[PDB]
Amino acid sequence: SRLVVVSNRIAPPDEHAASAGGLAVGILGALKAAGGLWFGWSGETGNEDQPLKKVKKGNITWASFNLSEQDLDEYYNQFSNAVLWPAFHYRLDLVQFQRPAWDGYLRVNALLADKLLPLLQDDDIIWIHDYHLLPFAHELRKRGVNNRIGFFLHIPFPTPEIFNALPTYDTLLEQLCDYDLLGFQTENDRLAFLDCLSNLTRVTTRSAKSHTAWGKAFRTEVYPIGIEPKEIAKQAAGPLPPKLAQLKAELKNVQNIFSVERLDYSKGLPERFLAYEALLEKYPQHHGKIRYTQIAPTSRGDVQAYQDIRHQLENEAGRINGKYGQLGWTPLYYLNQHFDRKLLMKIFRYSDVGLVTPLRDGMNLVAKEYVAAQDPANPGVLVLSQFAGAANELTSALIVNPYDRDEVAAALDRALTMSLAERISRHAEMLDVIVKNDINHWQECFISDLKQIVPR
């Protein structure tokens, strides 16, 4: 009956205290449709031995814990953010594996399982989310929890040649098979996991997507995470804040290219800046008549790799504006700031081009949000990296390879001069795909698949 969701990041009930990130947006979407309990990190450190904080808002209940400084450091900043995140994004050169980080990662997964245990009922359907919690089912099983437990990976699962470089890949794979159901964003993610598993041990697969390894039974499946198209429509059509109501009037003959994401090296922001520079170099007709705005709030700012990409991005903004700016025209607006999601939906609506070219991305909700926010009668154009999970479904976007800056520049140019009729038909095709594959659909398919398996 009752759904129990666990993730590291939560969306707070005070909704504009939100931090950038697709997982929390997704899960809140799901929970609002389902009902249930959300157990996860409050986002604060210190006071770890205080009782769980609990808030109820309609059909959702939140239970949060704090983490000690050391746990946050070893489990979150080191293992999750400087081993798993880079490795799953094919950045082995950025992995920073050390044994104490691994031990802390295991230590907090165990701790969190101790803290969740008293909240659970026999009934519960338990849904664990994302790379912070790979060991979590295994920790619940050793505490005797026999409930259905499903896992969903929000980020890519990398091929063996990358995954097996993890010193501890070994244990990770064993422990993932303690889940009853493993959900992935794309077929390639699922197949990659199954590949890694097969390299280590014999996996029997006697039915579509139903497996045995080390005598443990489990199911795999693909559920591309979505968005609430109706709600973003509503928020995108609400009035603009006064200061932006001005800027819209002033920029009446300027076209807007707009991008928004956490400042993460997975997102290819320097390559993007370079593609914009190539646009300005090779298509001088756009000078003074277009504007690229990049919103990039700091994310995980304690991890060295994140500091480096941020400094690199500041350099490129200064450089590009330094070179192509005029007294009365800044080509590139870089904002290292967090914007309310409500507001972003409006900004999307008034952008002529959404630029979403991550080097590697499990899904990318910004891409779907961009489409859902457009005025169907006069929609902008989506330029999308082929490496974003969303490219499997947003097939009518201008699909590009971000490693080819000139291909991205050309797609920006095509997007800026695209006729209304082509923009209508590209948009309506994309909108239909994301309406059919609702966050409500995601949630439904996963829970239904989970409820369908018999527990051990």
Add this chain to the structure above:
Amino acid sequence: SRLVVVSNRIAPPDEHAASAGGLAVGILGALKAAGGLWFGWSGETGNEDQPLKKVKKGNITWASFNLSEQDLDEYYNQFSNAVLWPAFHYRLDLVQFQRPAWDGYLRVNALLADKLLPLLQDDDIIWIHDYHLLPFAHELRKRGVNNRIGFFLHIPFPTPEIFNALPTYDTLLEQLCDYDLLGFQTENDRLAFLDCLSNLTRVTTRSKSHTAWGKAFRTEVYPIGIEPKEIAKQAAGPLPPKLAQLKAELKNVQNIFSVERLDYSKGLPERFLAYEALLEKYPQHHGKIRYTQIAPTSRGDVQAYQDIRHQLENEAGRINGKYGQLGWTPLYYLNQHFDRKLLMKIFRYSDVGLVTPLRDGMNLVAKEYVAAQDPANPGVLVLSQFAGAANELTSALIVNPYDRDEVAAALDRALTMSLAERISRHAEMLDVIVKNDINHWQECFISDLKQIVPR
């Protein structure tokens, strides 16, 4: 009779082929008033054995030479730009002394003296400019030239504690004393040179008239200036159509404006930091002000210049990233050269001129800013105390750039200053620069030179 001017940099007769830099602006100004021969580097490398190139335009004659790649490198990029420039600007940490650069520096001074020699007449009054040519009089003397030779240093002369770190300070000082007249931008520069000299040898001063090692020479101060009438004219000319638009659109935005070569002497990072402090501590200005910084690349082959440029690009991206809004860029950084004609107009329409070098011989941009202003509604000059110009632009808002909050506070005072206090500050500064004309500079120097008896 005939004046012979020599400098490394020249102002070409094709006038919009001009490169940023105050020396060439100054000397052209001077020569236009005097008449004369300008001998110097064409700005090109290769073909060094070709005849001098000569062009005559009115009362001025240009004679230029090319330099080899190696000479340019040793004399210009290394010794002049990576030893003398940083040392004279109190940046010993940036000096890059190596013996081959010193040898090349002497080698080209000698070469240039050979090339100049056949052009000279007994008559000539010879006026050598700037740190590239410290040894030049010495080179001319060993070739038997007995003419009056004056030198003018366009940049600061540093105190002994800095100057004496130069491995070769020694020879530099000996050789400076072969000039009949040494001119400096401020009294402190003159006194600093005299100090350095006194530390090395006994200097008799029986009158600014000296003896060292039995060589007689005179010292004097001539702060370089501007043509206030001509900039008035160019500042009042119509704006290019694109800028005529921007002025209309920025009707309720105040403009803080700065322009200079991208040089570490100019304290651009500290400036950016002062602007950040303005934005941090005076939030009332958000959306209502704009700081535009124009900084063309200078001497871009010298590592220290690359470093400062990268650092400035970082700060622009950082500051805009932190204080920018969807419809408001706090800081416009342009790494581009602008025509001087156009700058005069931009000055006129700026509410505040921000000129806060860490160290500067004079700084003509400060004087240009005041000369350009509409007397009836002038902007405010915020000026570093370390710019030579601060000795005379005493009515500017004088600040210490090492204190970003003092600079922010002066920016705020400048932005809210009444019309009356703008009128009276401006009319005092304008008078000082009108009285001390580039024409006055040129006249005082030549007159002082013509007044000494040659050896």
Add this chain to the structure above:
Amino acid sequence: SRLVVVSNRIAPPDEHAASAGGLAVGILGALKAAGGLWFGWSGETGNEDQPLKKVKKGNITWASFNLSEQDLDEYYNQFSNAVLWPAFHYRLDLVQFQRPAWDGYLRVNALLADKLLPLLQDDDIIWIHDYHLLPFAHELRKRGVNNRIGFFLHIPFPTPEIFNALPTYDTLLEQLCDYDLLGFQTENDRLAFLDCLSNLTRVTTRSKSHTAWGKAFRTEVYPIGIEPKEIAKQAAGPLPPKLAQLKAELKNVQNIFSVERLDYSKGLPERFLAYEALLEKYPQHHGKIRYTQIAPTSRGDVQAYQDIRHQLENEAGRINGKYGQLGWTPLYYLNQHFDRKLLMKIFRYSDVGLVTPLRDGMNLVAKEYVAAQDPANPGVLVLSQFAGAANELTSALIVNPYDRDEVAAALDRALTMSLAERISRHAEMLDVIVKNDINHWQECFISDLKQIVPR
């Protein structure tokens, strides 16, 4: 009949003009066994329109060309070294794709095919080597060459998820299928290529024998080897007098020794960090062990190579700074090239060979280390699981370089390993490499090639 080998890099006939790199060592090994014509770049730039340079030494003929500055830059430094090398080593973050480099890469492959054409006979068997020449068969096909052409890739072939990021992966795959035979270093490389191919087009495999776009071709694995008999000879020769000394002085110090091009594929910083962990967690080894790293600069014009080198310099200074003593330097980092002959001898006197690349097609240094050991008292090989050699050197201490403590622990195990366990580990490794001779490599590849019927 006649074998024609083409590679970018060649081993010169003056043998101590040799540059570090396994390809040239391999191919020379092969050619010495076979006989044949070696066509490739001389290593020099300029004079590109001069005739091919030809030298004959025994059963080998060399024919070399020069490259222009621009071709070297686009084809070698940019496309080969800053796109293909980093991508095939799973370093997409380092790829520096630009269209002019791609065009230059095509242009030089085409040019080289024009230059090779007149040397070819109908007879020939053509063997093309490495990532510089992926388009070469395609170029030869359009010039009408119907000969058997085999290709051998000396480096890894990356999985689709990486390979498909190449903007041009497309064309590369098409063109590789113009080879009759594609050879790889490990089964995984072969499978990865086949995967990439299958993602793009339908591949029929009715037998390692394939069809794509109606083109027939074969794939196979030939791990490249060494001459074990020759190194045994060169390892046992007398030491240079200076090193004869050091061996006497270091009698109670154990030597960990590593040698490779200073390449980011080799994981040198991670290696230094593993050594640091050894020194941190096993203090009993202080003053009693020594880690020497030899790392000649390779491809020093490519930014990513400069970066890794600067990082390595920093770590050497830091580690020595922290663990050194007045009479003990823990870590000897030498950014210098050593003659191969001499390296064999050093290997023989090292107690541990440390070979932990992050990613490596094969790694001959690992095989040379085993071949050089005195069978009666051999050192221990510590080997990254990511080196192709790990598929066969199964009895080395196999480690994951991303886990510095696993590497430190294996160094500790290696330093204290009993004679008996060193004898049996070494003999097992030596046998593998003796059965899989460079001669065997060459034989298998030629024999497979000679076995296909040409178009």
Add this chain to the structure above:
Amino acid sequence: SRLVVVSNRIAPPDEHAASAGGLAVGILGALKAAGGLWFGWSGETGNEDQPLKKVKKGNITWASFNLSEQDLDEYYNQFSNAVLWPAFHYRLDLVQFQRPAWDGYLRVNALLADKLLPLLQDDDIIWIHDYHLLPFAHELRKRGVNNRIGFFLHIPFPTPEIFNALPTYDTLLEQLCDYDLLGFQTENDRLAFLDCLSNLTRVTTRSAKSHTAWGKAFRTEVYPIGIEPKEIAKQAAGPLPPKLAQLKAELKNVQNIFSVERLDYSKGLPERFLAYEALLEKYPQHHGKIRYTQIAPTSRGDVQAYQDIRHQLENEAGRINGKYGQLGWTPLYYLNQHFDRKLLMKIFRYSDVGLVTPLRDGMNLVAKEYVAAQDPANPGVLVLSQFAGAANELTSALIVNPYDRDEVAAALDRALTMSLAERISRHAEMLDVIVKNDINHWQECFISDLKQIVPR
């Protein structure tokens, strides 16, 4: 009667808990000769409201305080270490002036004066040390202390053109004139101060070194800080630790160039490394036959400028050894470690060449220790920067300009090949100068000069 010494840094009574630095070595030397009370920072942070810690050892009494994290940061790391230290060492490019640092600097001087007040007697002769405490006399005066107060500046006093860049030079000068006696390390330092003062206000000087400014009377004088030549002789001749007894035997045909200092940018370590490289480049005869050992413990490692210089030095050690090393010869031994002073005396004795080439240095005791420790019958050679205060008296050292690496290399070469007779006579001249100007002489001259002025 009773002498009261105050400095930020103290030499602890547990003597091998000592931190590198000449001030504490000097003052302890002085106090051991005099007798007295030493009031200063314990070196610890936190517990700032605890009573002064007091220890008595013979004729010396220590009274120490802790500082809060914020006070340490503003007064010590920011103002003292990132404004005054760089400015007084002619590194305006490194000054990091901010008003909160200035306020904290004043705040702690005031606080320390409150803490000292109850310990003072009418009698006391008060001796304040170094740039941390420029305002201290002023603080004592406003609390009504009329005692003789002397100040001694251990570092250079920079010329007006540098000093006047300090936003706050103003107040600093006013407040220095509240001291009865101002002591400097060299005549140039004294003259520089007097210059700065003269630029601001009229100073009357009616006698040898006796002044009036703003109606405040005060005296100036020069007291070059020294060393205990007899004691270092003793410690230098003591047996070597067994490990070093070995190395000396093994290095019998290798000559040793040796340097030791805090890793500070004032010391010109990178320039030194470059001079060593030039020696190796231009004098290949020395390859395999010499060794340069640099000892450089981290100092003030929280200050960005110190981190920068350290990283730079690590790079140069790696680079130079990479380039000139051989399988059996490391040209350069860089050790980022603290060595006991006792041991250093011995390592000086056994060094052929002491390389002391700071870019700028108040005095430099390492230079004097280097000469005091040599075996008079077979002494090494001192190579000395002209910018070290010591160069005014160690006139027989090989004096060099560190900005000319080839001049420094040449001096190293001359030092390595100098005949015994020249080495004797250069050493005996230097030794006599430092014997005559004893730490005991320093202490005596200062106290005697102080005792000679009549208090207000």
